[PDB]
Amino acid sequence: MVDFAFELRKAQDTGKIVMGARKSIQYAKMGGAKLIIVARNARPDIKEDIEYYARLSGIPVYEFEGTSVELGTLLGRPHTVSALAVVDPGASAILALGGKE
């Protein structure tokens, strides 16, 4: 399976990720995101909007099985991260989280 923590950090280190719900929605809307990752406990209203804008734009969403505290810690951030957009996967296999289509 895709090693989420590794591939996510490798995309951070070698590609471009944009952090947060607001950026995730923005990049979904203008089609700049390749993949959106959302924390399972993203606040429900925000999550719904992320999921809508992604579906609108045909951007895959992958639900991190972890909290926004865990996701932010994974990304080396001192704050929660409820979602992010993969703008450039770099050298990583992060986009494979999106499925084969």
Author numbering: 0 to 100
Give me lines lifted from the publication on this model.
To study the contribution of charge-charge interactions to the thermostability and the reduced ΔCp of thermophilic proteins, our group had systematically removed 26 surface charges on T. celer L30e by single charge-to-alanine substitutions.
As a negative control, we have also used double-mutant cycles to study the pair-wise interaction between E90 and R92, which have a long separation distance of 10.8 Å. The crystal structures of the E6A/R92A, K46A/E62A, and E90A/R92A variants were determined at resolution ranging from 1.8 to 2.0 Å. The structures of all these variants can be superimposable with the wild-type structures. In contrast, the values of ΔΔGint were close to zero for the control pairs (E90/R92). On the other hand, for the E90A substitution that did not break any salt-bridge, there was no significant change in the value of ΔCp.
